[PDB]
Write a protein that binds this ligand. Structure first.
Ligand SMILES: NC(=O)c1ccc[n+]([C@@H]2O[C@H](COP(=O)([O-])OP(=O)(O)OC[C@H]3O[C@@H](n4cnc5c(N)ncnc54)[C@H](O)[C@@H]3O)[C@@H](O)[C@H]2O)c1
Ligand SMILES: NC(=O)c1ccc[n+]([C@@H]2O[C@H](COP(=O)([O-])OP(=O)(O)OC[C@H]3O[C@@H](n4cnc5c(N)ncnc54)[C@H](O)[C@@H]3O)[C@@H](O)[C@H]2O)c1
Ligand SMILES: Nc1ncnc2c1ncn2[C@@H]1O[C@H](CO)[C@@H](O)[C@H]1O
Ligand SMILES: Nc1ncnc2c1ncn2[C@@H]1O[C@H](CO)[C@@H](O)[C@H]1O
Lengths: 427, 427
């Protein structure tokens, strides 16, 4: 029993949804077709810390199909889909993950990925948020020597990598997967455009139309969140500290405001900043009865949930809580301030996760084979691989590329087969 | 009479609209307030080749207010606003520009900016499309030695600069103004979102709702063009050679198609590719009666207009022509295949042009003062100046920035005053 999941009998349900998801994830299935015979990951031993969803199940089985051995944990206490974890466990793949972990169980799960029977230890890390990278660096420095590198999924995780590199604390090569174009501009944006609304609806069933919704942060995540609620008839407000992002939001028709000014006016608050206490106690005290607060950024401290411990909490249903102020006023807190799309729904849909996870597999292949040519710094995959990820997803959604003629390729200074853009291109 | 314009008596009308535009261009007016006393451009002699519009008039007078002497020409034969040129000429500023220049008049106008009375010669170039840069390099190499650098406005122009640098043909420093974030992601995108529709309507008065419109190219320009027509109820098709840009368009709900497939289906065709003959004779032969074709990319060869010389052309009104095929079928060609927003309307509105032109002024200041620390390569302005451009435009449209606290700045690794993003950030 080299696994730990909530209920193993959910395996067959997990398997059925994984079968569906495979048809939504052509990038991963294309990598299996291209590489399953050559097994480029034979000899790879991957410790993974990434939301144990149906989509991640397809990622795991792609790594295994390419020859890898893996041990897996989720990177959020609420993000596991128990039936996905059970389907993976039933294949004999070590997974330590369930929805609703305590803090202690969470770190125990991560630790289980770092050693396996017969002296199994990872030579690769696959991380989403930097927790696994931190544990290894801080608590298992002997394991560091054997680790060829880490590939990192999300914006907050890559920020932690850059802080480490700035102070000489990064001891392994790192591939920034977030800043592949086919990740940051798809997952972060179009993923949240669908899964923010999903989390809100499943949790509260709230009408979006006519509501005043505030998005704190207008980066890739906040951009998608704004589109989502705007499409359903909300008046969308945006807060930003970056004047360029603020000008973008203003040019899309959003009023750019501070929560200091508008706290009494909002029905729904979404933190998308990757920052600390952007929603304070005073903000929440000023909010109307039954205001809905959630966080779609990576950590639980975008909202100061600590400041709410002084009040009575009344649970409505799992991951949906009332906080009752002394005058009787209530606010609704989603997922105890943690990732609302994964905590209250199922995260992003399979199709866009295929783009993110095709980048992950390519990074693991590149680290496994060529980590010796990398320094202890953070890199991105080259554009030719970024474009390949895009190409592998066009067929599913019926998009037909125009082929450049010789003179057209020459005219704009590109090879007919790409890359089509200079490295400084922002899309 | 050190100028050449269509009708000098239009000056007072030009002056009235320039006065209005100043209130729409807070970035330029802010630079005047900050720098008009210190005159950082005293001693600067700027030859400019850039659409002689009301907006460019505000740019010119900002350069002059900062101490510069300029000589100006337009970079398109149809893009001049005659009343803007007349207002500039009436100030005593040398301008050589009118709407409807012949090819010979066009290059004569450019040449006039390269020498003035009393042995006046430029020490700076301000270019939009690379024509002035080409003329100097190819036909005035003695003038090159005195030129401190060029600042270049648009995507096609910077591509020409990179081709030059790749072959050792660039002999002066160049600042890529297009790829300031506050240019490429605002001018190219939101500018075209309004001025493409403007050009189409003024030229043809065509209903957009219910039409099938094809956008060739889904870069910054094509992205804005698509939004424009989609907002007015067109079915918008997109063609792309770049799989990443294609996937973006598909994820916004556009069918990504080839003109080879859909020629019989389109009512309106817009080339936004910066490429050569993306619309061919056979495409146009297959199009329905009264199909509308236009180009919003920088040069007249996105559509093969040459292939239409074999047919009878019947003018409808200035810059709006019928091409009559042998079977009686007609197509409508806008502006002889040249920039439709500037040829058939007035280009982008003042507010977004203020963002582009605030970057231009900063680049000219940086070249004038520090060109000796630059090599003969193409550079961009640093992010701190990019963010300053954004800041200077927030007040006009009522956007209020959130100020980071000390711990929030530290938490994401930035200075409270910026820059807020790493150089690889794509917005
Ligand atoms: N839930 C998901 O599925 C998912 C997906 C991708 C990323 N994320 C996470 O979401 C967060 C945001 O990611 P991103 O890619 O959008 O980052 P980003 O850097 O592109 O955008 C964050 C924005 O927040 C703004 N901001 C920071 N502090 C602020 C403050 N106090 N007030 C207002 N605005 C402020 C910044 O100016 C920036 O524009 C990260 O923590 C990332 O890991 C979650
Ligand atoms: N009219 C204006 O006011 C205005 C403003 C800005 C830029 N421009 C001009 O517009 C052009 C496009 O600028 P941009 O910033 O969008 O460039 P971009 O590079 O961002 O976008 C151009 C796109 O065209 C695509 N493409 C190239 N050849 C193609 C083909 N044969 N078929 C289909 N797609 C093809 C490329 O893949 C690319 O995505 C340039 O010439 C630029 O100078 C005009
Ligand atoms: N359904 C999902 N399965 C796995 N990871 C997901 C899912 N939805 C979002 N994520 C990831 O969560 C990360 C933030 O922790 C994002 O960068 C995104 O890739
Ligand atoms: N109204 C306008 N005045 C001046 N330049 C403009 C205007 N509209 C668009 N342009 C410029 O035309 C360039 C293409 O030649 C674009 O990069 C854009 O900056």
């Amino acid at each position: 029993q080299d696994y730990k999941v909530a209920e193993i009998s959910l395996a067959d349900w997990g398997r059925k949804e994984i079968a569906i998801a495979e048809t939504e994830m052509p990038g991963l299935m294309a990598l299996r077709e291209e590489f399953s015979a050559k097994k480029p990951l034979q000899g790879a031993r991957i410790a993974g810390c990434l939301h144990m969803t149906i989509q991640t199940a397809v990622l795991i089985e792609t790594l295994v199909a390419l020859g890898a051995e893996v041990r897996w944990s989720s990177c959020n206490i609420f993000s596991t889909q128990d039936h996905a974890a059970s389907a993976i466990a039933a294949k004999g793949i070590p997974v330590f993950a369930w929805k609703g972990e305590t803090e202690e169980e969470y770190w125990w799960c991560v630790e289980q990925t770092l050693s396996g029977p017969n002296g199994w230890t990872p030579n690769l890390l696959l991380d989403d948020g930097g927790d696994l990278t931190q544990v290894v660096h801080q608590k298992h420095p002997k394991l560091l020597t054997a680790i060829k590198g880490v590939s990192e999924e999300t914006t907050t995780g890559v920020a932690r990598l850059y802080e480490m590199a700035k102070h000489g604390q990064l001891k392994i090569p790192a591939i920034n997967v977030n800043n592949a174009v086919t990740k940051s501009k798809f997952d972060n944006l179009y993923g949240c455009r669908e899964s923010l609304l999903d989390g809100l609806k499943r949790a509260t069933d709230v009408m979006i139309a006519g509501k005043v919704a505030l998005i704190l942060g207008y980066g890739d995540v906040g951009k998608g969140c704004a589109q989502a609620l705007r499409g359903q008839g909300a008046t969308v407000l945006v807060a930003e500290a970056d004047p360029i992002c603020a000008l973008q939001a203003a040019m899309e028709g959003y009023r750019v405001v501070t929560l200091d000014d508008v706290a009494e006016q909002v029905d729904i608050v979404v933190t998308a900043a990757g920052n600390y206490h952007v929603v304070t106690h005073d903000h929440m005290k000023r909010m109307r009865n039954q205001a809905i607060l959630c966080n779609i950024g990576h950590f639980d401290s975008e909202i100061d949930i600590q400041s709410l411990k002084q009040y009575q909490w009344e649970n409505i249903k799992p991951q949906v809580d009332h906080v009752i102020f002394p005058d009787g006023k209530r606010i609704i807190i989603l997922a105890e301030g943690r990732l609302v799309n994964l905590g209250c729904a199922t995260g992003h849909p399979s199709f866009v996760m295929s783009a993110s996870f095709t980048n992950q597999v390519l990074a693991q292949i590149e680290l496994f084979q060529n980590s010796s040519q990398y320094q202890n710094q953070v890199y991105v995959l080259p554009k030719v691989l970024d474009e390949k990820v895009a190409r592998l997803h066009l067929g599913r959604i019926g998009a037909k590329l125009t082929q450049l003629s010789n003179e057209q390729a020459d005219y704009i200074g590109v090879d007919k087969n790409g890359p089509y853009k200079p490295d400084h291109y922002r899309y």
